Amino acid sequence: EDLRLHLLLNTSVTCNDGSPAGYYLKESRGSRRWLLFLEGGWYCFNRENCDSRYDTMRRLMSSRDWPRTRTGTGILSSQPEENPYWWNANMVFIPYCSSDVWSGASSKEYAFMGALIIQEVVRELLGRGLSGAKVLLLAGSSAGGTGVLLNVDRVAEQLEKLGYPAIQVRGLADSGWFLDNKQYRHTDCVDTITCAPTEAIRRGIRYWNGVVPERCRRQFQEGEEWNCFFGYKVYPTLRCPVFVVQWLFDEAQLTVDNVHLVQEGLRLYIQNLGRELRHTLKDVPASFAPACLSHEIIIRSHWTDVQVKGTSLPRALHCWDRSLCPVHLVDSCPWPHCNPSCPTV
């Protein structure tokens, strides 16, 4: 009834500590639909920071403490009331071992192998019925939201080459759509939560040996690839269809912007921040963007609750799925919590 942990048979690919990585899987024999989900949870961009992560948040750097099962939740749920359309799919959960935002592409201190973990999961999954897929939805929240933009084209690229053009790769990027913007009040890039979006990815990419989508690559100068970690800069060049889910006021964005929760100025920064996001999302036909102040929704149980234009997110993904009922659901509402469906947990 729930998702069973499997470790990767090719043990070359590993977590930060070097423990083997893997995936949680729940099969649905009848279904030809698969969801792969990438866990979020920030990143770590140098030794001092990674060590500090290791002591504090060992789960996000090792497979040592990983439960033998997980219970599907939100979109991964098998409960038709939780997951009206997708409950019967085959579900894969990939724990965020790598700490690299899924960018890391080198085998060779810690090891950042996010991009390879995804490579290995897919090859193994083919062995388990994925070859019979008609749809592969690659989804993720937070850093997994970003991980999707970075990996989605690679995954499609990988499938054609292994000889499965029939599988239609798609993506869903929940809370992975960030802005490289001025912090409300500047802080030195010492502590991960506090470091500014650009400087953090500037440092990280070098550290992780991050690989970015080539199509995004050729659009920028070299040694300037950090650009591709931001949705609006990466989206236009995307070959696969990608649904974007984003709170007009992500908690995580406010964190990196150094907003701790008013002065007149403060109102405008937040006011503008929602404005800028709304703006970046104009060109994105398939998006769901409520004016609530929260981080992550897809993986959560109450995700069915949230509505934008009197439309459910789960409904919106269905419409979008059908399209390949409205599809561009973005709030035009100038303040946080100004939507009735805002989450309270």
Side-chain angles (χ1 to χ4, degrees), residues 1-25 27-31 33-107 110-190 192-218 220-334 336 338-345:
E1 74 278 23
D2 56 1
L3 302 83
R4 282 220 293 106
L5 175 43
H6 293 71
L7 301 165
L8 302 173
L9 301 164
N10 207 335
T11 55
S12 48
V13 190
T14 80
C15 304
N16 285 156
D17 73 346
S19 63
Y23 51 88
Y24 295 93
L25 166 62
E27 274 185 77
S28 193
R29 288 156 173 156
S31 178
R33 299 166 298 281
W34 296 67
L35 267 89
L36 275 50
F37 174 95
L38 315 175
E39 183 178 24
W42 308 84
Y43 42 73
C44 170
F45 59 63
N46 54 39
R47 212 215 189 87
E48 310 223 34
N49 269 15
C50 278
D51 293 346
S52 202
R53 207 189 207 218
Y54 193 76
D55 295 0
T56 312
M57 309 173 170
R58 227 168 295 248
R59 260 206 198 168
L60 281 172
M61 309 194 51
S62 195
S63 61
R64 283 165 89 234
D65 299 301
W66 280 4
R68 57 163 197 112
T69 72
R70 277 183 170 264
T71 287
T73 171
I75 210 169
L76 295 144
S77 179
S78 291
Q79 298 211 39
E81 230 175 319
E82 287 224 24
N83 207 349
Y85 314 92
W86 272 300
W87 61 268
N88 193 61
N90 302 0
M91 265 132 303
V92 178
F93 184 95
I94 304 171
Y96 189 28
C97 251
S98 66
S99 307
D100 49 355
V101 188
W102 297 94
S103 73
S106 58
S107 294
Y110 302 96
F112 311 90
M113 312 180 60
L116 305 183
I117 288 147
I118 303 187
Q119 297 207 344
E120 292 320 303
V121 178
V122 169
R123 279 201 191 180
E124 298 193 13
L125 283 177
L126 278 162
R128 280 164 158 78
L130 183 62
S131 44
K134 293 214 168 215
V135 163
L136 187 163
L137 185 55
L138 175 66
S141 282
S142 195
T146 313
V148 158
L149 305 150
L150 300 164
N151 288 283
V152 73
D153 287 330
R154 258 192 281 280
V155 187
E157 194 195 19
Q158 177 177 350
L159 282 177
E160 297 160 356
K161 231 71 159 177
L162 295 184
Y164 296 98
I167 314 169
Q168 288 190 341
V169 175
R170 297 168 196 177
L172 162 66
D174 165 21
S175 291
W177 187 275
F178 298 95
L179 301 191
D180 51 341
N181 61 322
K182 189 168 193 140
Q183 298 195 293
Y184 166 76
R185 226 160 170 183
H186 177 262
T187 60
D188 213 294
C189 181
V190 194
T192 186
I193 43 142
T194 38
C195 189
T198 307
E199 197 48 20
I201 328 279
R202 290 202 52 88
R203 289 147 86 121
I205 295 174
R206 274 183 284 212
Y207 196 50
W208 314 321
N209 282 68
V211 285
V212 290
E214 183 188 300
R215 228 172 319 269
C216 186
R217 246 201 292 281
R218 49 184 190 115
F220 285 98
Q221 178 200 291
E222 186 177 318
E224 281 290 304
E225 295 88 356
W226 62 266
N227 277 269
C228 295
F229 279 71
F230 298 74
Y232 74 108
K233 295 179 179 199
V234 64
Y235 188 71
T237 78
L238 279 178
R239 199 163 90 97
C240 301
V242 163
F243 199 105
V244 165
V245 182
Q246 190 66 48
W247 303 102
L248 294 188
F249 305 90
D250 212 281
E251 181 214 79
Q253 180 71 50
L254 294 164
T255 304
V256 293
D257 271 359
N258 200 109
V259 165
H260 307 140
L261 288 179
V262 319
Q263 284 172 113
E264 294 65 75
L266 182 45
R267 295 181 291 107
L268 290 46
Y269 190 89
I270 315 179
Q271 193 169 314
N272 288 198
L273 181 165
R275 193 192 303 259
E276 283 194 33
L277 274 67
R278 206 169 322 130
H279 186 71
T280 59
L281 292 161
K282 289 181 187 281
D283 287 16
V284 185
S287 61
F288 190 88
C292 303
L293 189 166
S294 169
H295 169 91
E296 282 173 287
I297 194 43
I298 298 302
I299 193 64
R300 294 170 185 272
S301 286
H302 293 269
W303 78 301
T304 52
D305 307 340
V306 69
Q307 299 192 131
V308 167
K309 292 175 194 172
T311 305
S312 303
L313 160 61
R315 168 83 174 157
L317 260 70
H318 181 65
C319 298
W320 172 71
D321 175 15
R322 181 158 92 92
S323 87
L324 306 150
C325 63
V327 182
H328 192 287
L329 296 307
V330 179
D331 262 356
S332 57
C333 187
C338 73
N339 184 300
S341 330
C342 290
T344 178
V345 300

